Amino acid sequence: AEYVRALFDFNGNDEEDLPFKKGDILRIRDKPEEQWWNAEDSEGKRGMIPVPYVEKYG
């Protein structure tokens, strides 16, 4: 929980869903749900995204 990347892309719009790509990098800031995590895009936008549609980085 700190750095995750999407390998399925989705692009929501933000303000409710962090738009990612099929291999985008993000950071885990909050986690209200279990399936959706509040990660921040490289832009610094706090939005929820699917954990199954993304992974973690090292």
Side-chain angles (χ1 to χ4, degrees):
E2 44 125 46
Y3 256 118
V4 288
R5 61 210 39 212
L7 346 90
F8 227 102
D9 152 65
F10 171 54
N11 240 303
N13 249 334
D14 101 72
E15 101 97 33
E16 179 158 32
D17 280 308
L18 157 42
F20 53 85
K21 269 223 217 188
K22 69 271 112 115
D24 171 28
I25 264 72
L26 0 145
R27 170 239 224 274
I28 248 64
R29 171 170 265 280
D30 250 64
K31 163 250 218 77
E33 315 289 290
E34 226 192 32
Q35 154 179 246
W36 285 79
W37 287 349
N38 215 107
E40 255 171 318
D41 207 54
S42 288
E43 303 278 47
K45 46 142 75 80
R46 326 194 280 169
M48 264 211 276
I49 41 78
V51 186
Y53 247 52
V54 321
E55 37 126 330
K56 255 103 153 287
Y57 163 71

